[PDB]
Assembly symmetry: D2
């Protein structure tokens, strides 16, 4: 999870666009 | 769920590096 | 994305609790 | 990201079930 900010900050923003 | 490749590519490829 | 509502609806709520 | 191992150790396996 050292990588987690980098992974998640894409997906939660893409989520807000997608409407999952 | 139209977004559910595109969002996931932006984590699963980073997971591959991170080792979450 | 058969799995999407099972992945996302956990993880975005877990995010809401975490602060990733 | 304190939540992130316990999030994604589900979600990566749910991805491996889905095929996202």
């Amino acid at each position: 999870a050292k990588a987690a900010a980098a992974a998640i900050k894409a997906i939660a923003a893409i989520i807000k666009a997608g409407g999952f």
